[PDB]
Amino acid sequence: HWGYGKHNGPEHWHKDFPIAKGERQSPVDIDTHTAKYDPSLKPLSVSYDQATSLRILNNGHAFNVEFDDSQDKAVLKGGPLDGTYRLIQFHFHWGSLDGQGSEHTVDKKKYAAELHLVHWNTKYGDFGKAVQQPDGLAVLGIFLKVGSAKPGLQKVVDVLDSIKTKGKSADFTNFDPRGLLPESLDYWTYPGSLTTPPLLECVTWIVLKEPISVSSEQVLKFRKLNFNGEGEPEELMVDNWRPAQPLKNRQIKASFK
Ligand SMILES: CC(C)(C)c1cc(=O)[nH]c(SCC(=O)c2ccc(Cl)c(S(N)(=O)=O)c2)n1
Ligand code: NA
Ligand SMILES: [Zn+2]
């Protein structure tokens, strides 16, 4: 039932998932001036050399590219984290227009899209158990701006036509997520939540300072996807982002400057 429309959008989610109004919801506006620099933060460690992509799915909310997380093959560590977190999937949120689409904002600025590389703490054994823990997930958020193409994204954009409607999936092997990373790993970090129901407060958010550039044609193809299932009426998959939520009693830390 939840979705991104007038009748089932972010403003309605609290009725099914009361934690929507909780103490550590995501996303948030990142006020770059009042984020606290912390020289004790470690560089982020992104080890994606052995990543095994498997499949791409349209789940009716976004598309997920999933990875084999049954061994430590693509891991996030270091940065603000004490655990090791295995990459399970990445997905994006995007807008109907280049002027919006990101979930996190930076000094109130919206980006055309936001990538989320979702990782779970190896100490909880699997994704389902990790989401039930305040330190279960580490999500690496990367902003997309529209400009030059990101060559490393194109293999993704080119399969979208095969997963147009809700429920479709396609084989998606040998995709290297290192081709989606900006040059710098400088980051902001804060404790927060999934940005979709069930909105569980289990995420350490690591949002990179440097956006990647993608072309207008690349983002255009995201917007040709559908929220509906095949042979139901066409509802374009656009604006699948949750707006910024109150920061409440949290401090955003910066690894830099
Ligand atoms: C998250 C889970 C429970 C697998 C799920 C359930 C659901 O009903 N709909 C969706 S769609 C969004 C999504 O798959 C997902 C998974 C993990 C994370 Cl951390 C995030 S986010 N948007 O916080 O990064 C989204 N996902
Ligand atoms: Na262009
Ligand atoms: Zn997300």
mmCIF file of N, CA, C and O in Angstrom, residues 132-201:
data_model
loop_
_atom_site.group_PDB
_atom_site.id
_atom_site.type_symbol
_atom_site.label_atom_id
_atom_site.label_comp_id
_atom_site.label_asym_id
_atom_site.label_seq_id
_atom_site.Cartn_x
_atom_site.Cartn_y
_atom_site.Cartn_z
ATOM 1 N N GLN A 132 17.058 -5.255 12.397
ATOM 2 C CA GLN A 132 16.414 -5.195 13.678
ATOM 3 C C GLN A 132 17.381 -4.616 14.752
ATOM 4 O O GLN A 132 17.073 -4.640 15.950
ATOM 5 N N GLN A 133 18.548 -4.135 14.336
ATOM 6 C CA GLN A 133 19.593 -3.661 15.261
ATOM 7 C C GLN A 133 19.976 -2.214 15.013
ATOM 8 O O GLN A 133 20.116 -1.820 13.863
ATOM 9 N N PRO A 134 20.249 -1.437 16.088
ATOM 10 C CA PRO A 134 20.520 0.003 15.911
ATOM 11 C C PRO A 134 21.804 0.217 15.093
ATOM 12 O O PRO A 134 22.001 1.306 14.505
ATOM 13 N N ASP A 135 22.678 -0.792 15.033
ATOM 14 C CA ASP A 135 23.899 -0.684 14.206
ATOM 15 C C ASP A 135 23.951 -1.744 13.097
ATOM 16 O O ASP A 135 25.036 -2.235 12.736
ATOM 17 N N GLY A 136 22.791 -2.092 12.549
ATOM 18 C CA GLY A 136 22.723 -3.216 11.644
ATOM 19 C C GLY A 136 23.202 -2.895 10.240
ATOM 20 O O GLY A 136 23.710 -3.775 9.560
ATOM 21 N N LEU A 137 22.982 -1.659 9.778
ATOM 22 C CA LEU A 137 23.248 -1.295 8.384
ATOM 23 C C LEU A 137 24.218 -0.108 8.281
ATOM 24 O O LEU A 137 24.283 0.753 9.193
ATOM 25 N N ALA A 138 24.961 -0.039 7.168
ATOM 26 C CA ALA A 138 25.741 1.159 6.849
ATOM 27 C C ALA A 138 25.360 1.469 5.422
ATOM 28 O O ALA A 138 25.476 0.576 4.568
ATOM 29 N N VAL A 139 24.835 2.669 5.169
ATOM 30 C CA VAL A 139 24.435 2.933 3.793
ATOM 31 C C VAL A 139 25.331 4.067 3.275
ATOM 32 O O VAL A 139 25.498 5.104 3.953
ATOM 33 N N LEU A 140 25.946 3.817 2.116
ATOM 34 C CA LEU A 140 26.763 4.848 1.475
ATOM 35 C C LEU A 140 25.902 5.594 0.462
ATOM 36 O O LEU A 140 25.475 5.003 -0.504
ATOM 37 N N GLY A 141 25.651 6.888 0.711
ATOM 38 C CA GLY A 141 24.788 7.716 -0.125
ATOM 39 C C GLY A 141 25.673 8.571 -1.039
ATOM 40 O O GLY A 141 26.588 9.256 -0.564
ATOM 41 N N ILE A 142 25.374 8.609 -2.334
ATOM 42 C CA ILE A 142 26.169 9.383 -3.270
ATOM 43 C C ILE A 142 25.152 10.221 -4.119
ATOM 44 O O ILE A 142 24.224 9.705 -4.707
ATOM 45 N N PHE A 143 25.330 11.521 -4.157
ATOM 46 C CA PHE A 143 24.459 12.421 -4.981
ATOM 47 C C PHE A 143 24.764 12.320 -6.445
ATOM 48 O O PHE A 143 25.904 12.095 -6.829
ATOM 49 N N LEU A 144 23.738 12.366 -7.284
ATOM 50 C CA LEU A 144 23.930 12.506 -8.700
ATOM 51 C C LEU A 144 23.519 13.916 -9.099
ATOM 52 O O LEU A 144 22.383 14.320 -8.784
ATOM 53 N N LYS A 145 24.404 14.597 -9.841
ATOM 54 C CA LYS A 145 24.030 15.814 -10.598
ATOM 55 C C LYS A 145 24.040 15.544 -12.122
ATOM 56 O O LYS A 145 24.765 14.687 -12.622
ATOM 57 N N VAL A 146 23.238 16.311 -12.850
ATOM 58 C CA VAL A 146 23.154 16.138 -14.300
ATOM 59 C C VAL A 146 24.276 16.985 -14.969
ATOM 60 O O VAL A 146 24.427 18.229 -14.693
ATOM 61 N N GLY A 147 25.075 16.309 -15.789
ATOM 62 C CA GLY A 147 26.162 16.985 -16.514
ATOM 63 C C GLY A 147 26.742 16.042 -17.531
ATOM 64 O O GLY A 147 26.023 15.494 -18.380
ATOM 65 N N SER A 148 28.024 15.794 -17.424
ATOM 66 C CA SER A 148 28.610 14.723 -18.277
ATOM 67 C C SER A 148 28.090 13.311 -17.817
ATOM 68 O O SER A 148 27.693 13.127 -16.649
ATOM 69 N N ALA A 149 28.017 12.365 -18.748
ATOM 70 C CA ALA A 149 27.663 10.977 -18.437
ATOM 71 C C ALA A 149 28.640 10.313 -17.462
ATOM 72 O O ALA A 149 29.847 10.646 -17.436
ATOM 73 N N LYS A 150 28.124 9.362 -16.684
ATOM 74 C CA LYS A 150 28.950 8.479 -15.863
ATOM 75 C C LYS A 150 29.055 7.123 -16.628
ATOM 76 O O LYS A 150 28.051 6.391 -16.760
ATOM 77 N N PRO A 151 30.241 6.836 -17.249
ATOM 78 C CA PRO A 151 30.300 5.678 -18.147
ATOM 79 C C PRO A 151 29.975 4.435 -17.352
ATOM 80 O O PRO A 151 29.312 3.572 -17.872
ATOM 81 N N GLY A 152 30.442 4.403 -16.097
ATOM 82 C CA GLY A 152 30.240 3.305 -15.166
ATOM 83 C C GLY A 152 28.798 2.987 -14.785
ATOM 84 O O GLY A 152 28.529 1.907 -14.257
ATOM 85 N N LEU A 153 27.877 3.909 -15.090
ATOM 86 C CA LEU A 153 26.449 3.687 -14.903
ATOM 87 C C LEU A 153 25.711 3.130 -16.097
ATOM 88 O O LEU A 153 24.576 2.738 -15.997
ATOM 89 N N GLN A 154 26.315 3.216 -17.263
ATOM 90 C CA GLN A 154 25.558 2.944 -18.478
ATOM 91 C C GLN A 154 25.116 1.522 -18.573
ATOM 92 O O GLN A 154 24.052 1.269 -19.115
ATOM 93 N N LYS A 155 25.911 0.578 -18.072
ATOM 94 C CA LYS A 155 25.478 -0.852 -18.177
ATOM 95 C C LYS A 155 24.158 -1.028 -17.388
ATOM 96 O O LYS A 155 23.270 -1.816 -17.747
ATOM 97 N N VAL A 156 23.989 -0.204 -16.352
ATOM 98 C CA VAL A 156 22.727 -0.200 -15.583
ATOM 99 C C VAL A 156 21.590 0.419 -16.415
ATOM 100 O O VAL A 156 20.512 -0.144 -16.516
ATOM 101 N N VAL A 157 21.811 1.600 -16.975
ATOM 102 C CA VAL A 157 20.785 2.302 -17.707
ATOM 103 C C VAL A 157 20.330 1.444 -18.889
ATOM 104 O O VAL A 157 19.161 1.330 -19.171
ATOM 105 N N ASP A 158 21.265 0.757 -19.522
ATOM 106 C CA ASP A 158 20.904 -0.052 -20.688
ATOM 107 C C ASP A 158 20.057 -1.304 -20.491
ATOM 108 O O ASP A 158 19.555 -1.846 -21.488
ATOM 109 N N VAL A 159 19.939 -1.804 -19.260
ATOM 110 C CA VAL A 159 19.102 -3.006 -18.969
ATOM 111 C C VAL A 159 17.725 -2.586 -18.473
ATOM 112 O O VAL A 159 16.808 -3.398 -18.367
ATOM 113 N N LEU A 160 17.509 -1.299 -18.178
ATOM 114 C CA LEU A 160 16.230 -0.866 -17.554
ATOM 115 C C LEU A 160 14.952 -1.240 -18.327
ATOM 116 O O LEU A 160 13.879 -1.486 -17.722
ATOM 117 N N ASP A 161 15.085 -1.259 -19.654
ATOM 118 C CA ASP A 161 13.986 -1.561 -20.548
ATOM 119 C C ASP A 161 13.525 -3.027 -20.348
ATOM 120 O O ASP A 161 12.356 -3.330 -20.523
ATOM 121 N N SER A 162 14.429 -3.911 -19.945
ATOM 122 C CA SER A 162 14.051 -5.281 -19.598
ATOM 123 C C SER A 162 13.370 -5.449 -18.226
ATOM 124 O O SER A 162 12.847 -6.506 -17.974
ATOM 125 N N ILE A 163 13.376 -4.421 -17.345
ATOM 126 C CA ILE A 163 12.685 -4.511 -16.022
ATOM 127 C C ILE A 163 11.715 -3.330 -15.841
ATOM 128 O O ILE A 163 11.737 -2.607 -14.820
ATOM 129 N N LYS A 164 10.928 -3.049 -16.878
ATOM 130 C CA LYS A 164 10.177 -1.795 -16.903
ATOM 131 C C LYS A 164 9.116 -1.706 -15.818
ATOM 132 O O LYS A 164 8.879 -0.622 -15.237
ATOM 133 N N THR A 165 8.463 -2.842 -15.542
ATOM 134 C CA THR A 165 7.344 -2.827 -14.612
ATOM 135 C C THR A 165 7.671 -3.625 -13.344
ATOM 136 O O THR A 165 8.594 -4.453 -13.314
ATOM 137 N N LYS A 166 6.944 -3.308 -12.290
ATOM 138 C CA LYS A 166 7.027 -3.945 -10.957
ATOM 139 C C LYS A 166 7.089 -5.449 -10.965
ATOM 140 O O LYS A 166 6.304 -6.131 -11.629
ATOM 141 N N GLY A 167 8.085 -5.990 -10.298
ATOM 142 C CA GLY A 167 8.238 -7.413 -10.316
ATOM 143 C C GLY A 167 9.178 -7.984 -11.341
ATOM 144 O O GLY A 167 9.612 -9.136 -11.139
ATOM 145 N N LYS A 168 9.518 -7.243 -12.425
ATOM 146 C CA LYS A 168 10.464 -7.786 -13.395
ATOM 147 C C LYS A 168 11.868 -7.811 -12.848
ATOM 148 O O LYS A 168 12.255 -6.900 -12.088
ATOM 149 N N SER A 169 12.634 -8.835 -13.245
ATOM 150 C CA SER A 169 14.018 -8.959 -12.891
ATOM 151 C C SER A 169 14.828 -9.446 -14.072
ATOM 152 O O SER A 169 14.295 -10.013 -15.060
ATOM 153 N N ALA A 170 16.116 -9.207 -14.008
ATOM 154 C CA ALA A 170 16.949 -9.655 -15.087
ATOM 155 C C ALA A 170 18.284 -9.986 -14.514
ATOM 156 O O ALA A 170 18.736 -9.384 -13.500
ATOM 157 N N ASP A 171 18.906 -10.986 -15.140
ATOM 158 C CA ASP A 171 20.306 -11.361 -14.831
ATOM 159 C C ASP A 171 21.203 -10.122 -14.991
ATOM 160 O O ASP A 171 21.050 -9.337 -15.953
ATOM 161 N N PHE A 172 22.085 -9.907 -14.017
ATOM 162 C CA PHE A 172 22.936 -8.704 -14.054
ATOM 163 C C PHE A 172 24.309 -8.975 -13.436
ATOM 164 O O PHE A 172 24.632 -8.544 -12.314
ATOM 165 N N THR A 173 25.115 -9.748 -14.132
ATOM 166 C CA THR A 173 26.383 -10.228 -13.596
ATOM 167 C C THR A 173 27.523 -9.343 -14.034
ATOM 168 O O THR A 173 27.357 -8.618 -15.021
ATOM 169 N N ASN A 174 28.606 -9.356 -13.256
ATOM 170 C CA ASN A 174 29.937 -8.746 -13.569
ATOM 171 C C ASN A 174 29.803 -7.208 -13.650
ATOM 172 O O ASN A 174 30.503 -6.550 -14.431
ATOM 173 N N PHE A 175 28.838 -6.674 -12.912
ATOM 174 C CA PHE A 175 28.764 -5.199 -12.755
ATOM 175 C C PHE A 175 29.709 -4.712 -11.637
ATOM 176 O O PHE A 175 29.624 -5.220 -10.529
ATOM 177 N N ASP A 176 30.614 -3.761 -11.919
ATOM 178 C CA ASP A 176 31.590 -3.282 -10.953
ATOM 179 C C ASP A 176 31.116 -1.978 -10.287
ATOM 180 O O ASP A 176 31.122 -0.910 -10.960
ATOM 181 N N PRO A 177 30.683 -2.039 -9.008
ATOM 182 C CA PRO A 177 30.097 -0.799 -8.424
ATOM 183 C C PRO A 177 31.137 0.298 -8.201
ATOM 184 O O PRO A 177 30.786 1.460 -7.922
ATOM 185 N N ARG A 178 32.412 -0.030 -8.401
ATOM 186 C CA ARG A 178 33.496 1.008 -8.267
ATOM 187 C C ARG A 178 33.371 2.087 -9.328
ATOM 188 O O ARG A 178 33.879 3.188 -9.152
ATOM 189 N N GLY A 179 32.687 1.759 -10.420
ATOM 190 C CA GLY A 179 32.421 2.704 -11.490
ATOM 191 C C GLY A 179 31.328 3.711 -11.164
ATOM 192 O O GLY A 179 31.059 4.585 -11.958
ATOM 193 N N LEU A 180 30.750 3.648 -9.966
ATOM 194 C CA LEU A 180 29.738 4.641 -9.520
ATOM 195 C C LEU A 180 30.265 5.629 -8.475
ATOM 196 O O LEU A 180 29.485 6.468 -7.935
ATOM 197 N N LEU A 181 31.545 5.526 -8.157
ATOM 198 C CA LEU A 181 32.109 6.281 -7.023
ATOM 199 C C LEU A 181 32.709 7.593 -7.507
ATOM 200 O O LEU A 181 33.323 7.643 -8.591
ATOM 201 N N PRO A 182 32.537 8.677 -6.719
ATOM 202 C CA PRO A 182 33.258 9.868 -7.080
ATOM 203 C C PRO A 182 34.756 9.691 -6.727
ATOM 204 O O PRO A 182 35.159 8.670 -6.182
ATOM 205 N N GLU A 183 35.564 10.717 -7.009
ATOM 206 C CA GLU A 183 36.977 10.664 -6.770
ATOM 207 C C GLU A 183 37.267 10.748 -5.285
ATOM 208 O O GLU A 183 38.106 10.004 -4.763
ATOM 209 N N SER A 184 36.571 11.628 -4.565
ATOM 210 C CA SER A 184 36.939 11.772 -3.143
ATOM 211 C C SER A 184 36.025 10.875 -2.286
ATOM 212 O O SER A 184 34.858 10.773 -2.606
ATOM 213 N N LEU A 185 36.524 10.327 -1.185
ATOM 214 C CA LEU A 185 35.664 9.626 -0.196
ATOM 215 C C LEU A 185 35.391 10.476 1.058
ATOM 216 O O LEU A 185 34.937 9.952 2.064
ATOM 217 N N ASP A 186 35.685 11.779 1.023
ATOM 218 C CA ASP A 186 35.241 12.649 2.120
ATOM 219 C C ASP A 186 33.729 12.454 2.349
ATOM 220 O O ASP A 186 32.963 12.332 1.367
ATOM 221 N N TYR A 187 33.301 12.466 3.620
ATOM 222 C CA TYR A 187 31.908 12.143 3.943
ATOM 223 C C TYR A 187 31.354 12.883 5.171
ATOM 224 O O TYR A 187 32.115 13.440 5.977
ATOM 225 N N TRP A 188 30.015 12.911 5.290
ATOM 226 C CA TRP A 188 29.308 13.261 6.499
ATOM 227 C C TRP A 188 28.681 11.968 7.006
ATOM 228 O O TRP A 188 28.400 11.031 6.225
ATOM 229 N N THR A 189 28.494 11.866 8.314
ATOM 230 C CA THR A 189 27.877 10.661 8.894
ATOM 231 C C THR A 189 26.951 11.034 10.037
ATOM 232 O O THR A 189 27.211 12.000 10.757
ATOM 233 N N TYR A 190 25.833 10.294 10.182
ATOM 234 C CA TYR A 190 24.918 10.486 11.278
ATOM 235 C C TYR A 190 24.144 9.183 11.429
ATOM 236 O O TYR A 190 24.098 8.372 10.440
ATOM 237 N N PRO A 191 23.534 8.960 12.620
ATOM 238 C CA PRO A 191 22.688 7.798 12.806
ATOM 239 C C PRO A 191 21.251 8.049 12.317
ATOM 240 O O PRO A 191 20.640 9.045 12.702
ATOM 241 N N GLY A 192 20.707 7.144 11.510
ATOM 242 C CA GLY A 192 19.331 7.354 10.981
ATOM 243 C C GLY A 192 18.598 6.053 10.645
ATOM 244 O O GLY A 192 18.741 5.090 11.401
ATOM 245 N N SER A 193 17.772 6.042 9.587
ATOM 246 C CA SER A 193 16.815 5.003 9.374
ATOM 247 C C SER A 193 16.816 4.575 7.898
ATOM 248 O O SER A 193 17.439 5.301 7.067
ATOM 249 N N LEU A 194 16.147 3.438 7.565
ATOM 250 C CA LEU A 194 15.703 3.243 6.169
ATOM 251 C C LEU A 194 14.851 4.433 5.782
ATOM 252 O O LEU A 194 14.090 4.985 6.625
ATOM 253 N N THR A 195 14.929 4.826 4.510
ATOM 254 C CA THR A 195 14.132 5.910 4.035
ATOM 255 C C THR A 195 12.836 5.454 3.365
ATOM 256 O O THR A 195 12.076 6.322 2.856
ATOM 257 N N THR A 196 12.617 4.127 3.325
ATOM 258 C CA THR A 196 11.376 3.565 2.929
ATOM 259 C C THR A 196 10.812 2.701 4.073
ATOM 260 O O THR A 196 11.575 2.186 4.888
ATOM 261 N N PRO A 197 9.480 2.543 4.097
ATOM 262 C CA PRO A 197 8.959 1.606 5.086
ATOM 263 C C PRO A 197 9.736 0.284 4.968
ATOM 264 O O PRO A 197 10.068 -0.149 3.837
ATOM 265 N N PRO A 198 10.013 -0.379 6.104
ATOM 266 C CA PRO A 198 9.478 -0.085 7.466
ATOM 267 C C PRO A 198 10.204 1.004 8.288
ATOM 268 O O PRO A 198 9.874 1.183 9.483
ATOM 269 N N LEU A 199 11.097 1.793 7.653
ATOM 270 C CA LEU A 199 11.632 3.027 8.297
ATOM 271 C C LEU A 199 12.386 2.667 9.588
ATOM 272 O O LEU A 199 12.511 3.473 10.505
ATOM 273 N N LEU A 200 12.928 1.462 9.617
ATOM 274 C CA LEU A 200 13.627 0.972 10.836
ATOM 275 C C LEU A 200 14.875 1.802 11.103
ATOM 276 O O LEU A 200 15.699 2.088 10.181
ATOM 277 N N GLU A 201 15.047 2.136 12.379
ATOM 278 C CA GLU A 201 16.165 2.975 12.793
ATOM 279 C C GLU A 201 17.481 2.143 13.040
ATOM 280 O O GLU A 201 17.924 1.962 14.187
#
